[PDB]
Tab-separated table of C-alpha atoms and ligand atoms in Angstrom:
chain	number	residue	atom	x	y	z
A	1	UNK	CA	-83.737	-39.443	69.938
A	2	UNK	CA	-81.039	-42.142	69.592
A	3	UNK	CA	-77.501	-41.267	68.948
A	4	UNK	CA	-77.270	-39.739	64.972
A	5	UNK	CA	-73.510	-40.561	63.662
A	6	UNK	CA	-71.897	-38.663	60.977
A	7	UNK	CA	-70.683	-39.987	57.494
A	8	UNK	CA	-68.325	-38.777	55.184
A	9	UNK	CA	-68.669	-39.057	51.342
A	10	UNK	CA	-65.577	-38.623	48.975
A	11	UNK	CA	-65.447	-38.374	45.056
A	12	UNK	CA	-62.577	-40.701	45.401
A	13	UNK	CA	-62.585	-44.217	46.648
A	14	UNK	CA	-59.965	-45.923	48.734
A	15	UNK	CA	-57.455	-48.043	46.569
A	16	UNK	CA	-58.559	-46.196	43.020
A	17	UNK	CA	-56.161	-46.406	40.185
A	18	UNK	CA	-56.321	-44.332	37.253
A	19	UNK	CA	-58.093	-41.310	38.842
A	20	UNK	CA	-58.389	-38.654	36.108
A	21	UNK	CA	-57.369	-35.182	37.423
A	22	UNK	CA	-59.893	-33.451	35.273
A	23	UNK	CA	-61.662	-32.463	38.321
A	24	UNK	CA	-61.570	-31.696	41.804
A	25	UNK	CA	-61.580	-34.097	44.972
A	26	UNK	CA	-63.955	-33.208	47.372
A	27	UNK	CA	-65.014	-34.633	50.724
A	28	UNK	CA	-68.615	-34.134	52.279
A	29	UNK	CA	-70.066	-34.734	55.453
A	30	UNK	CA	-73.596	-35.873	56.567
A	31	UNK	CA	-75.206	-35.918	59.959
A	32	UNK	CA	-72.351	-33.905	60.834
A	33	UNK	CA	-69.538	-30.782	60.054
A	34	UNK	CA	-66.269	-31.829	58.823
A	35	UNK	CA	-63.695	-30.925	61.974
A	36	UNK	CA	-60.342	-31.490	59.686
A	37	UNK	CA	-59.619	-32.471	56.417
A	38	UNK	CA	-55.955	-33.057	54.648
A	39	UNK	CA	-54.554	-34.502	51.157
A	40	UNK	CA	-51.028	-34.909	50.703
A	41	UNK	CA	-49.262	-36.062	47.985
A	42	UNK	CA	-46.551	-39.496	47.951
A	43	UNK	CA	-43.599	-36.774	48.890
A	44	UNK	CA	-46.127	-35.652	52.142
A	45	UNK	CA	-46.647	-32.151	50.467
A	46	UNK	CA	-50.145	-30.940	51.180
A	47	UNK	CA	-52.491	-30.213	48.881
A	48	UNK	CA	-54.088	-26.377	48.762
A	49	UNK	CA	-58.095	-27.079	49.891
A	50	UNK	CA	-60.897	-24.954	50.936
A	51	UNK	CA	-63.467	-26.227	53.679
A	52	UNK	CA	-66.902	-24.695	52.772
A	53	UNK	CA	-68.646	-21.897	55.557
A	54	UNK	CA	-71.347	-24.292	56.564
A	55	UNK	CA	-68.667	-27.079	57.040
A	56	UNK	CA	-70.146	-29.688	55.190
A	57	UNK	CA	-68.161	-29.566	52.052
A	58	UNK	CA	-64.155	-29.913	51.101
A	59	UNK	CA	-62.911	-29.221	47.813
A	60	UNK	CA	-59.075	-29.323	46.326
A	61	UNK	CA	-58.558	-25.830	44.983
A	62	UNK	CA	-55.348	-26.498	42.956
A	63	UNK	CA	-54.525	-28.727	39.985
A	64	UNK	CA	-53.838	-32.184	41.088
A	65	UNK	CA	-51.150	-33.938	39.049
A	66	UNK	CA	-50.492	-36.657	37.091
A	67	UNK	CA	-48.720	-40.057	38.295
A	68	UNK	CA	-49.361	-39.403	42.008
A	69	UNK	CA	-50.077	-41.014	44.658
A	70	UNK	CA	-52.396	-38.947	47.079
A	71	UNK	CA	-53.036	-39.333	50.763
A	72	UNK	CA	-56.805	-38.293	52.035
A	73	UNK	CA	-57.883	-37.845	55.623
A	74	UNK	CA	-61.246	-36.525	56.799
A	75	UNK	CA	-62.815	-36.393	60.466
A	76	UNK	CA	-66.300	-35.638	60.433
A	77	UNK	CA	-67.839	-34.260	64.528
A	78	UNK	CA	-71.371	-34.482	65.125
A	79	UNK	CA	-73.753	-34.490	68.212
A	80	UNK	CA	-74.085	-38.249	68.229
A	81	UNK	CA	-70.002	-39.483	67.943
A	82	UNK	CA	-67.563	-38.810	65.184
A	83	UNK	CA	-66.157	-40.636	62.094
A	84	UNK	CA	-62.956	-40.691	60.479
A	85	UNK	CA	-61.535	-41.892	57.289
A	86	UNK	CA	-58.135	-42.615	55.320
A	87	UNK	CA	-58.292	-42.887	51.658
A	88	UNK	CA	-55.389	-43.332	49.215
A	89	UNK	CA	-55.671	-43.318	45.300
A	90	UNK	CA	-53.454	-43.088	42.544
A	91	UNK	CA	-53.908	-40.576	39.171
A	92	UNK	CA	-53.229	-40.932	35.751
A	93	UNK	CA	-49.835	-41.912	34.522
A	94	UNK	CA	-50.202	-40.682	31.062
A	95	UNK	CA	-48.000	-42.442	28.274
A	96	UNK	CA	-47.570	-39.124	26.078
A	97	UNK	CA	-49.138	-35.443	26.757
A	98	UNK	CA	-50.187	-32.972	24.200
A	99	UNK	CA	-50.577	-29.491	24.413
A	100	UNK	CA	-53.169	-27.203	22.449
A	101	UNK	CA	-53.221	-24.048	20.714
A	102	UNK	CA	-56.260	-21.844	19.751
A	103	UNK	CA	-56.833	-19.324	17.604
A	104	UNK	CA	-57.725	-16.386	17.304
A	105	UNK	CA	-55.633	-14.968	19.788
A	106	UNK	CA	-57.593	-14.103	23.270
A	107	UNK	CA	-59.330	-10.540	22.759
A	108	UNK	CA	-58.614	-10.325	19.098
A	109	UNK	CA	-61.510	-8.787	16.631
A	110	UNK	CA	-61.696	-11.038	13.399
A	111	UNK	CA	-63.796	-10.908	10.371
A	112	UNK	CA	-67.141	-12.879	9.402
A	113	UNK	CA	-64.849	-16.124	8.329
A	114	UNK	CA	-62.862	-16.949	10.963
A	115	UNK	CA	-63.499	-20.118	12.498
A	116	UNK	CA	-62.098	-21.388	16.165
A	117	UNK	CA	-59.102	-23.365	15.586
A	118	UNK	CA	-57.611	-26.192	18.357
A	119	UNK	CA	-54.333	-27.225	17.464
A	120	UNK	CA	-52.691	-30.054	19.208
A	121	UNK	CA	-48.922	-30.769	19.063
A	122	UNK	CA	-49.567	-34.445	18.649
A	123	UNK	CA	-51.608	-37.003	16.694
A	124	UNK	CA	-55.407	-37.147	18.355
A	125	UNK	CA	-56.316	-40.622	18.271
A	126	UNK	CA	-59.525	-40.222	20.066
A	127	UNK	CA	-61.303	-36.926	18.308
A	128	UNK	CA	-64.800	-37.927	20.125
A	129	UNK	CA	-63.237	-36.876	23.532
A	130	UNK	CA	-61.502	-33.673	22.350
A	131	UNK	CA	-64.720	-32.363	20.733
A	132	UNK	CA	-66.230	-33.371	24.399
A	133	UNK	CA	-63.438	-31.444	26.009
A	134	UNK	CA	-64.024	-28.360	24.205
A	135	UNK	CA	-66.863	-26.208	25.102
A	136	UNK	CA	-67.880	-23.191	22.629
A	137	UNK	CA	-69.877	-20.250	23.975
A	138	UNK	CA	-71.668	-17.754	21.324
A	139	UNK	CA	-73.806	-14.740	22.029
A	140	UNK	CA	-76.198	-14.331	20.545
A	141	UNK	CA	-76.222	-18.292	20.645
A	142	UNK	CA	-75.557	-19.923	17.086
A	143	UNK	CA	-75.438	-23.761	15.813
A	144	UNK	CA	-71.574	-25.082	14.477
A	145	UNK	CA	-70.166	-28.193	14.858
A	146	UNK	CA	-66.585	-29.751	14.738
A	147	UNK	CA	-64.546	-31.046	11.646
A	148	UNK	CA	-61.221	-31.907	11.710
A	149	UNK	CA	-58.393	-30.541	9.106
A	150	UNK	CA	-55.600	-33.380	9.872
A	151	UNK	CA	-54.958	-35.699	13.227
A	152	UNK	CA	-53.931	-32.428	15.236
A	153	UNK	CA	-56.312	-29.771	14.518
A	154	UNK	CA	-59.893	-29.343	14.626
A	155	UNK	CA	-62.376	-26.767	13.409
A	156	UNK	CA	-65.577	-25.370	14.725
A	157	UNK	CA	-67.820	-22.762	12.760
A	158	UNK	CA	-71.588	-22.280	12.295
A	159	UNK	CA	-73.039	-22.934	8.760
A	160	UNK	CA	-72.831	-19.499	7.267
A	161	UNK	CA	-70.338	-16.453	8.066
A	162	UNK	CA	-70.602	-15.460	11.540
A	163	UNK	CA	-72.716	-12.250	12.391
A	164	UNK	CA	-70.929	-9.093	13.029
A	165	UNK	CA	-71.176	-8.368	16.945
A	166	UNK	CA	-71.149	-12.034	17.846
A	167	UNK	CA	-69.214	-12.862	21.118
A	168	UNK	CA	-67.437	-16.560	21.425
A	169	UNK	CA	-65.508	-18.244	24.365
A	170	UNK	CA	-63.377	-20.844	23.841
A	171	UNK	CA	-62.785	-23.543	26.791
A	172	UNK	CA	-60.156	-26.478	25.679
A	173	UNK	CA	-60.550	-28.394	29.369
A	174	UNK	CA	-58.238	-30.943	28.205
A	175	UNK	CA	-56.136	-31.379	31.399
A	176	UNK	CA	-56.494	-34.738	32.853
A	177	UNK	CA	-58.831	-35.855	29.959
A	178	UNK	CA	-57.629	-39.543	27.966
A	179	UNK	CA	-57.126	-38.376	24.363
A	180	UNK	CA	-56.722	-41.924	23.303
A	181	UNK	CA	-53.502	-44.147	23.503
A	182	UNK	CA	-52.597	-42.815	26.828
A	183	UNK	CA	-52.400	-39.246	25.330
A	184	UNK	CA	-53.687	-36.768	28.133
A	185	UNK	CA	-53.890	-32.925	27.780
A	186	UNK	CA	-50.668	-31.168	29.063
A	187	UNK	CA	-53.005	-27.740	30.590
A	188	UNK	CA	-56.578	-26.118	29.360
A	189	UNK	CA	-56.833	-23.289	27.514
A	190	UNK	CA	-59.439	-20.363	27.759
A	191	UNK	CA	-60.142	-17.768	24.484
A	192	UNK	CA	-62.263	-15.554	23.839
A	193	UNK	CA	-62.898	-13.307	20.702
A	194	UNK	CA	-65.436	-11.193	18.954
A	195	UNK	CA	-66.933	-10.740	15.542
A	196	UNK	CA	-66.014	-7.168	13.909
A	197	UNK	CA	-67.074	-6.007	10.151
A	198	UNK	CA	-68.487	-7.664	7.501
A	199	UNK	CA	-65.687	-7.488	4.932
A	200	UNK	CA	-65.690	-9.917	1.705
A	201	UNK	CA	-63.423	-9.261	-1.248
A	202	UNK	CA	-64.181	-10.901	-4.499
A	203	UNK	CA	-61.852	-11.574	-7.555
A	204	UNK	CA	-63.641	-12.287	-10.764
A	205	UNK	CA	-61.312	-14.078	-13.069
A	206	UNK	CA	-63.539	-13.085	-16.054
A	207	UNK	CA	-62.996	-8.896	-14.948
A	208	UNK	CA	-59.625	-9.491	-13.774
A	209	UNK	CA	-60.684	-6.947	-10.649
A	210	UNK	CA	-60.461	-7.695	-6.771
A	211	UNK	CA	-63.370	-6.043	-5.393
A	212	UNK	CA	-63.463	-5.489	-1.802
A	213	UNK	CA	-66.682	-4.676	0.213
A	214	UNK	CA	-67.165	-3.692	3.469
A	215	UNK	CA	-70.859	-3.912	4.838
A	216	UNK	CA	-71.884	-4.694	1.699
A	217	UNK	CA	-70.814	-1.588	-0.137
A	218	UNK	CA	-67.654	-1.023	-2.232
A	219	UNK	CA	-64.977	0.306	-0.957
A	220	UNK	CA	-61.906	-0.660	-3.322
A	221	UNK	CA	-61.406	-1.812	-6.869
A	222	UNK	CA	-58.195	-3.521	-7.218
A	223	UNK	CA	-56.742	-4.500	-10.707
A	224	UNK	CA	-55.333	-8.065	-10.361
A	225	UNK	CA	-53.161	-10.756	-11.933
A	226	UNK	CA	-53.964	-14.305	-10.770
A	227	UNK	CA	-52.661	-17.809	-11.527
A	228	UNK	CA	-51.969	-18.335	-15.221
A	229	UNK	CA	-53.504	-21.471	-16.548
A	230	UNK	CA	-50.474	-23.764	-16.021
A	231	UNK	CA	-50.797	-22.962	-12.067
A	232	UNK	CA	-53.977	-21.132	-11.475
A	233	UNK	CA	-55.551	-19.858	-8.660
A	234	UNK	CA	-58.034	-22.021	-7.206
A	235	UNK	CA	-61.999	-20.966	-6.776
A	236	UNK	CA	-63.780	-20.832	-3.511
A	237	UNK	CA	-63.880	-19.447	-0.463
A	238	UNK	CA	-60.438	-17.910	1.499
A	239	UNK	CA	-59.967	-16.995	5.175
A	240	UNK	CA	-57.470	-14.155	5.515
A	241	UNK	CA	-54.625	-15.022	7.930
A	242	UNK	CA	-51.372	-13.804	8.891
A	243	UNK	CA	-50.065	-10.322	7.519
A	244	UNK	CA	-46.847	-9.002	6.573
A	245	UNK	CA	-45.153	-5.993	5.380
A	246	UNK	CA	-42.642	-7.938	3.586
A	247	UNK	CA	-41.955	-11.358	3.437
A	248	UNK	CA	-39.646	-13.483	1.547
A	249	UNK	CA	-41.744	-16.161	-0.854
A	250	UNK	CA	-39.860	-19.468	-1.048
A	251	UNK	CA	-40.808	-22.142	-3.073
A	252	UNK	CA	-38.922	-25.029	-0.911
A	253	UNK	CA	-41.354	-24.496	2.276
A	254	UNK	CA	-43.645	-26.894	0.184
A	255	UNK	CA	-41.084	-29.412	-1.344
A	256	UNK	CA	-40.439	-27.175	-4.432
A	257	UNK	CA	-36.678	-26.761	-4.777
A	258	UNK	CA	-35.949	-23.103	-5.582
A	259	UNK	CA	-33.865	-24.402	-8.575
A	260	UNK	CA	-36.630	-25.909	-10.414
A	261	UNK	CA	-38.446	-24.555	-13.483
A	262	UNK	CA	-41.500	-24.107	-11.362
A	263	UNK	CA	-39.529	-22.755	-8.262
A	264	UNK	CA	-39.055	-19.745	-6.892
A	265	UNK	CA	-37.670	-17.384	-4.372
A	266	UNK	CA	-38.748	-13.320	-4.384
A	267	UNK	CA	-38.906	-10.583	-1.517
A	268	UNK	CA	-42.238	-9.112	-1.750
A	269	UNK	CA	-44.272	-6.337	0.020
A	270	UNK	CA	-47.457	-5.956	1.986
A	271	UNK	CA	-48.432	-9.620	1.510
A	272	UNK	CA	-51.686	-10.826	3.177
A	273	UNK	CA	-51.925	-14.624	3.394
A	274	UNK	CA	-55.387	-16.449	2.440
A	275	UNK	CA	-53.858	-20.259	1.705
A	276	UNK	CA	-51.731	-22.580	3.526
A	277	UNK	CA	-51.054	-23.661	-0.106
A	278	UNK	CA	-49.545	-20.285	-0.641
A	279	UNK	CA	-51.956	-17.725	-2.071
A	280	UNK	CA	-51.172	-14.106	-0.981
A	281	UNK	CA	-52.506	-10.940	-2.035
A	282	UNK	CA	-49.196	-8.816	-2.067
A	283	UNK	CA	-47.545	-5.955	-4.286
A	284	UNK	CA	-46.628	-6.773	-7.764
A	285	UNK	CA	-44.534	-4.011	-9.475
A	286	UNK	CA	-43.638	-6.476	-12.071
A	287	UNK	CA	-47.347	-7.303	-13.145
A	288	UNK	CA	-48.821	-3.592	-13.126
A	289	UNK	CA	-49.380	-3.820	-16.820
A	290	UNK	CA	-50.760	-7.425	-16.771
A	291	UNK	CA	-52.738	-6.807	-13.335
A	292	UNK	CA	-56.649	-6.097	-14.887
A	293	UNK	CA	-55.851	-7.914	-18.023
A	294	UNK	CA	-53.817	-11.492	-18.091
A	295	UNK	CA	-52.929	-13.996	-15.363
A	296	UNK	CA	-49.129	-14.409	-14.925
A	297	UNK	CA	-48.562	-15.339	-11.400
A	298	UNK	CA	-48.543	-19.186	-9.165
A	299	UNK	CA	-51.457	-18.459	-7.710
A	300	UNK	CA	-51.424	-15.500	-5.610
A	301	UNK	CA	-53.370	-12.336	-6.504
A	302	UNK	CA	-50.838	-10.073	-7.877
A	303	UNK	CA	-51.814	-6.171	-7.310
A	304	UNK	CA	-50.318	-2.938	-7.328
A	305	UNK	CA	-48.103	-1.830	-4.221
A	306	UNK	CA	-50.468	1.005	-2.960
A	307	UNK	CA	-53.648	-1.708	-2.923
A	308	UNK	CA	-51.371	-4.368	-1.842
A	309	UNK	CA	-50.595	-1.952	1.201
A	310	UNK	CA	-54.457	-0.834	1.548
A	311	UNK	CA	-55.331	-4.866	1.660
A	312	UNK	CA	-52.598	-4.965	4.491
A	313	UNK	CA	-53.931	-1.986	5.946
A	314	UNK	CA	-58.040	-2.610	5.977
A	315	UNK	CA	-58.300	-6.433	6.131
A	316	UNK	CA	-57.981	-8.491	9.313
A	317	UNK	CA	-57.837	-11.841	10.319
A	318	UNK	CA	-61.088	-13.759	9.808
A	319	UNK	CA	-62.022	-11.528	6.433
A	320	UNK	CA	-63.051	-13.286	3.424
A	321	UNK	CA	-61.539	-13.408	-0.248
A	322	UNK	CA	-63.941	-15.193	-3.036
A	323	UNK	CA	-62.153	-16.332	-6.446
A	324	UNK	CA	-64.687	-17.218	-8.910
A	325	UNK	CA	-64.791	-18.244	-13.011
A	326	UNK	CA	-61.090	-19.352	-12.909
A	327	UNK	CA	-59.648	-21.810	-14.870
A	328	UNK	CA	-58.759	-23.987	-11.849
A	329	UNK	CA	-60.945	-26.098	-9.271
A	330	UNK	CA	-61.984	-25.610	-5.759
A	331	UNK	CA	-59.864	-24.508	-2.873
A	332	UNK	CA	-59.468	-27.667	-0.986
A	333	UNK	CA	-61.789	-27.467	2.235
A	334	UNK	CA	-58.829	-29.064	4.400
A	335	UNK	CA	-56.311	-26.432	3.109
A	336	UNK	CA	-56.041	-24.679	6.472
A	337	UNK	CA	-57.921	-21.466	5.308
A	338	UNK	CA	-60.807	-23.114	3.104
A	339	UNK	CA	-63.060	-24.376	5.459
A	340	UNK	CA	-66.040	-22.912	4.085
A	341	UNK	CA	-65.678	-24.789	0.748
A	342	UNK	CA	-66.756	-27.967	2.611
A	343	UNK	CA	-70.606	-28.168	2.116
A	344	UNK	CA	-72.316	-27.617	5.670
A	345	UNK	CA	-73.813	-31.005	5.408
A	346	UNK	CA	-70.503	-32.463	5.466
A	347	UNK	CA	-69.055	-30.693	8.046
A	348	UNK	CA	-71.967	-30.817	10.227
A	349	UNK	CA	-71.552	-34.899	10.160
A	350	UNK	CA	-68.085	-34.088	11.294
A	351	UNK	CA	-65.283	-36.653	10.928
A	352	UNK	CA	-64.732	-37.960	14.621
A	353	UNK	CA	-65.000	-41.433	13.628
B	401	KUL	C1	-47.070	-16.202	-4.124
B	401	KUL	C2	-46.631	-16.028	-5.452
B	401	KUL	C3	-47.379	-17.236	-5.774
B	401	KUL	O1	-47.785	-17.508	-6.962
B	401	KUL	N1	-47.736	-18.251	-4.733
B	401	KUL	C4	-48.155	-19.583	-4.772
B	401	KUL	C5	-47.393	-20.947	-4.760
B	401	KUL	C6	-47.685	-21.891	-5.014
B	401	KUL	S1	-46.622	-23.418	-5.040
B	401	KUL	C7	-45.855	-23.670	-3.319
B	401	KUL	O2	-45.463	-23.051	-5.925
B	401	KUL	O3	-47.425	-24.228	-5.738
B	401	KUL	C8	-49.202	-21.945	-4.874
B	401	KUL	C9	-49.922	-21.148	-4.811
B	401	KUL	C10	-49.605	-20.094	-4.760
B	401	KUL	F1	-50.434	-18.966	-4.491
B	401	KUL	C11	-47.028	-17.648	-3.689
B	401	KUL	O4	-46.659	-17.972	-2.789
B	402	CL	CL1	-56.092	-28.960	53.879
B	403	CL	CL1	-46.109	-25.536	18.914
B	404	CL	CL1	-52.342	-17.399	-19.098
B	405	CL	CL1	-42.568	-18.568	2.086
B	406	NA	NA1	-79.742	-46.669	70.011
B	407	NA	NA1	-43.019	-15.036	-8.248
C-alpha cells in the first residue's frame, strides 16, 4: 500500500468575493484528520469554531459579519503525510439593511383568524427571496401560502380558519440573504404561537345586534350602532387586533383633519381594534338609545360600556368579527386585518411578482 495523502475541502474558495453569511463555513478532511483549523477576520480577531469528535469536520460556531475579509488556515494529518491550505474570502457588503418584525408574539395564544405576519422596516425588492427565507411549521400540518399586503409586510395563512390547538413555528432566516438591490437581512427571527378557542362575533345590520359565539355557542348578544349611511361599516371578515382600556380616537392619524366636518377627536373606553382603517368595538354611552336600532358612527361598532368591557375581556388577538348586510362594500383584503376577504385562489397564487 503506497502513501495515502490527506485532502482538505472547505465550503468557501480561496479568493472568493460576495460570500453570503447565511451559512457557516466548514472544513473537511479526507484520508486524514484535522490537526489545526483557525479563522480570523481582517483585524486578526479569531472566529469561534468547533472541531468534531472524529476530527473530520470543523465549522464556525458564531455568526459571520458583513463587509469582512476572513482568512482560514487548516492542517490535515494522516498516515501518509500532511496537507495545509490558506484561504481568504470576502463576505457580502450590503448597500442597506432591513430588520424584520414578526407577529403574533412568541408564546402567545391567538384566535383562529390570526395570520403569520412578517414586517420589514424597508421596501423588499425581491419578495421571492424573502418568502424562501421564511420557514413556517404547523402541527397538525396545514397548507398555507404567502401574500403581500404592501411592499414591506407579508402574510401567511391557510385557506380556512386555523383549527384550535394548532402549533405554529416561524423562523425568519433573513440574515445574510440578499433581499434585493443590496438589501440584506439585519438579523433572524424565531417566533412560536398556538391557536386557542374559536371565537366568532357576527354583526348583522338587519338586526343591529353583535352576537359573540364561542366554540359555536352564543354567549353574548350586544345591541350595537354601526356606521351611518354616509360612512358605513364595511361588510366582510375582520381580525381582532390590539385592545385598549381607553384610547383617544384622533381622525388626523388617517389624514382627516380633526377640524373638519368629518373629523373627530374623542376619548373612548374598552376599545378593541378590528381594522387598520379605524374600525373598533368600543364603549359608546352617547348611543345606547341608538344601539340595536339605527346606525350613527363613522364605522366603529358602538356598544354599551358593559358589553364593550366584556368584549375587551373575552376576546383575544386573532378572533374574528364578521359584518354582514350593511349598505357598505367589502373590507379591503389588504387593510391589515382583512386578510380573509381575499379569495383563497388569489391569496394562494400570491403576488411575489
Ligand atoms: C372609531 C369611531 C369611528 O367611527 N371610527 C372610524 C373612523 C374612520 S375614518 C379615519 O374617519 O375614515 C373609519 C372607520 C371607523 F370605524 C373610529 O376610529
Ligand atoms: Cl478555531
Ligand atoms: Cl420598526
Ligand atoms: Cl342612517
Ligand atoms: Cl386613533
Ligand atoms: Na507510490
Ligand atoms: Na366619535
